[PDB]
Design a protein around this nucleic acid. Structure first.
Lengths: 59, 38, 142, 173, 208
RNA sequence: GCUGAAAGCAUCUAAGCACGAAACUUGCCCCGAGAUGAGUUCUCCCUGACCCUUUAAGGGUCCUGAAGGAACGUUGAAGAC
RNA sequence: GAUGUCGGCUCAUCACAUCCUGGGGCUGAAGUAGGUCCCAAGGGUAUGGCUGUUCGCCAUUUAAAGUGGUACGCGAGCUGG
RNA sequence: GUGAAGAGGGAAACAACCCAGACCGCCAGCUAAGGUCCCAAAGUCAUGGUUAAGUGGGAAACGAUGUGGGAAGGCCCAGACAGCCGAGUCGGCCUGCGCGGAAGAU
């Protein structure tokens, strides 16, 4: 369930789940999927910031 | 018409043609030479 | 903490309108099923319906590849001994154009009460007009 | 290829109009129109027409040859026209013309009446001879074949409707 | 074309001068009165509705009476409908008589057949009886076998069995029109038609 | 079978056009909106006062009882009931 | 610590490697009548003498008297040679 | 070697095949075989080729100008092949993927 929700949230900001996870690993962020899904539902500005971090790591 | 699995030319006036996915032999000299693969 | 779950009494839904002229049948059906189930929202929950309403226009101008227009066969059985029956894609388009999209989308949804409920939000027409202007749908590009 | 590489001359007294893939040829004998395939480009230089493949297709040359042959036939037709001849062989076989209908007696228990399409004319210089005139090669061919189908030449004596220049083989019992 | 509603009176015969006896059914056809016209704009098809006969006032309920009073005609014993063809027109309140069949040669007649009740297979489906002697044991009019073994292991749909027989709608086609009498409202046809004496009939021009 | 190239000829086929069977889909007869996707058309009937409370698709009291239906009786060429 | 086994009667349902009717190509196919192969499963497809027989032989009919699967279909449906 | 006397994941379902040996709890993380369009968790990923048969998603001897690659030949601007004048044309060899051969009982 957590994975499905994270995919849905990431595609609304412009990236796919696999790429998002790869970027977080390359940036050394260690937040797990339960917390990621909770933030996806309850706080969207913070989730957008996380997506930007991953994109910068991949760039 | 000759319906068989091995079809081939039988004289110098025979011709081979492909129609709608089938292989056929037509001849302008002998009606007995008309063949269809099947 | 406990993980969030949606509630059928407070979900929100929206109305979209789509045009099928020249689109590939299966690659349109996948998107329709996705958005009817609600896999594109962050609130998705397997046991609740969190989908949207979709109108489809021009169902008689949908496209297929290869030799399928004359070679794809639909089958069904009537329940009586010996009652097996068939039609081709061309025939189906000639007499019941909407069924072509309806059957394809129905095959891609979950099986059961909730899936039968999800199917009720799809409205397919054969021409270029509908009578749902009171709901104010928005244009969706697929 | 070789057929498509020879240009087609447009003599004096014929008008050529091109629009997308639709072509119209107008002369003294009438007017003809045709739509071409999506892999052929046609050009009207000064007094000639040329045909070529369009980049993006794998069978441009065959289509070009076909288009060349068709346009050549159209140009000949709008100025000279095409004619065909049919002959009857047998006892009691007869043909006649009235308006745009051919009446045939060919040994049946009823008469045969054939209604000519639009643009084809017929004449009967003799009770055992038919001549067709027109401007469309395919249409005239189809009309002749339909007339022949009523009674085909048989192999023991040769009776029936035949083309004028046709060789009919015979055999013994 | 349109047809008419009538009533079955009985059966008789007609003698001809050459010495032939034609058996006939006698149908009484009073005037049919038009109650409603249905068109494409308002209903989606083209038809007329008619009544015939008479009915006592204290058996007519208020809805029915209002429907009759809209058209402006007297109440009858029922309502029937007929489909229209291209170039056929009628108006509400108009009367149609049996002189409609003056030049028709053949008709089709429709009615409700006599009811036999619960019936066996011998009378309902023409089954054959088994032996009456030679050691038969309680199986004289019974149906026999009704299936096969473990394959398929069931009974197929549409099997022929005992049940209710009759009392349903039946049509008989292509009957010669023998006489049309307009001063007495009579139509005479050749042969038998479904129903019992006193029942309702629908008469139409023949479709084949 | 017609017209026609790839393959300067020929060729029913690759682009185009025409015929062709008791098999297929209709045309004939019967059922059919529980088709839960539960459709359409015509006609008819009902036009009073109060109270409480946790304030709502809320509970109760007096006055009122239409269109129509069911029940009972005499019964049918309808029927095991 | 039980799945009744031949033949007949009653009642059937499916396949196509087609007996009849329908549409075709070749013939050492003049006509009438035949031979061989391709397509087609809509409907149709005997009564008696002998024998427990299924088969088979014989008598007289028919457009024709198809070939197979279904616990060698069918005994909580009948018979018992 | 495994089952017998062995649970978990894959092969639709499937003791004996592939991965792997369950002391108890957790709404943490990494991988194996096998996978990433929707039923159903994850690439409608990137770059260069092949196939037109729904081949992929059942079968042989044998038959044919389907069409992709390779190494060598005969004739030809001193005029080749075809038909009735001007650039190509003939037939063998090895190899990749497709085509016919292909008829059954709710």
């Amino acid at each position: 369930l957590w994975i499905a929700r994270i995919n849905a949230a990431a595609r609304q900001n412009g990236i796919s789940y696999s790429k998002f996870i790869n970027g977080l690993k390359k940036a050394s962020v260690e937040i797990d999927r339960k917390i990621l899904a909770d933030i996806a539902v309850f706080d969207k500005v913070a989730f957008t910031a996380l997506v930007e971090k991953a994109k910068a790591a991949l760039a | 018409m000759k319906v068989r699995a091995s079809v081939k030319k039988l004289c110098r006036n025979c011709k081979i043609v492909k129609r709608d996915g089938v292989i056929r032999v037509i001849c302008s000299a002998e009606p007995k030479h008309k063949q269809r693969q099947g | 903490m406990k993980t969030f779950t949606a509630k059928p009494e407070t979900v929100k839904r929206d109305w979209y309108v789509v045009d099928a002229t020249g689109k590939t049948l299966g690659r349109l059906a996948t998107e329709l099923a996705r958005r009817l189930r609600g896999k594109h929202k962050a609130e998705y929950t397997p046991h609740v319906d969190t989908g949207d309403y979709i109108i489809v226009l021009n169902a008689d101008k949908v496209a297929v590849t290869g030799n399928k227009r004359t070679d794809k066969v639909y089958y069904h059985h009537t329940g009586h001994i010996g009652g097996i029956k068939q039609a081709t894609f061309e025939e189906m388009i000639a007499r019941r154009p909407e069924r072509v999209i309806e059957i394809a989308v129905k095959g891609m949804l979950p099986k059961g009460p909730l899936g039968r409920a999800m199917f009720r939000k799809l409205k397919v027409y054969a021409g270029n007009e509908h009578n749902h202007a009171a709901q104010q749908p928005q244009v969706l590009d697929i | 290829s070789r057929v498509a590489k020879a240009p087609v001359v447009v003599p004096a007294g014929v008008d050529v109009k091109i629009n997308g893939q639709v072509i119209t040829i107008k002369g003294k004998n009438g007017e003809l129109t045709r739509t071409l395939n999506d892999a052929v480009e046609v050009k009207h230089a000064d007094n000639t027409l040329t045909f070529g493949p369009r980049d993006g297709y794998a069978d441009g040359w065959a289509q070009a040859g076909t288009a060349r042959a068709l346009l050549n036939s159209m140009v000949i037709g709008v100025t000279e026209g095409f004619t065909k001849k049919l002959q009857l062989v047998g006892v009691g076989y007869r043909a006649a013309v009235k308006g745009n209908v051919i009446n045939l007696s060919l040994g049946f228990s009823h008469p045969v009446d054939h209604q000519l399409p639009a643009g084809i004319t017929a004449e009967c210089p003799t009770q055992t001879e038919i001549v067709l005139k027109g401007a469309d090669k395919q249409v005239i061919g189809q009309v002749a074949a339909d007339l022949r189908a009523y009674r085909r030449p048989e192999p023991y004596k040769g009776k029936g409707v035949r083309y004028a220049d046709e060789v009919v083989r015979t055999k013994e019992a | 074309m349109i047809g008419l509603v009538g009533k079955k009176v009985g059966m008789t015969r007609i003698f001809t001068e050459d010495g032939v006896s034609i058996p006939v059914t006698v149908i009484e056809v009073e005037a049919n009165r038009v109650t409603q016209v249905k068109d494409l704009a308002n209903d989606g098809y083209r038809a007329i509705q008619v009544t015939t006969g008479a009915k006592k006032a204290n058996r007519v309920t208020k809805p029915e009476a209002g429907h009759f009073a809209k058209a402006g005609v007297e109440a009858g014993r029922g309502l029937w409908e007929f489909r229209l063809a291209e170039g056929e027109e009628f108006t509400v309140g108009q009367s149609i008589s049996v002189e409609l069949f003056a030049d028709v040669k053949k008709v089709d007649v429709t009615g409700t057949s006599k009811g036999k009740g619960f019936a066996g297979t011998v009378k309902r489906w023409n089954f054959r009886t088994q032996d009456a002697t030679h050691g038969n044991s309680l199986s004289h009019r019974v149906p026999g076998s009704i299936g096969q073994n473990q394959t398929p292991g069931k009974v197929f749909k549409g099997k022929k069995m005992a049940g209710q027989m009759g009392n349903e709608r039946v049509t008989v086609q292509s009957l010669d029109v023998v006489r049309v009498d307009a001063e007495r409202n009579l139509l005479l046809v050749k042969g038998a038609v479904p129903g019992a004496t006193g029942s309702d009939l629908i008469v139409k021009p023949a479709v084949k």
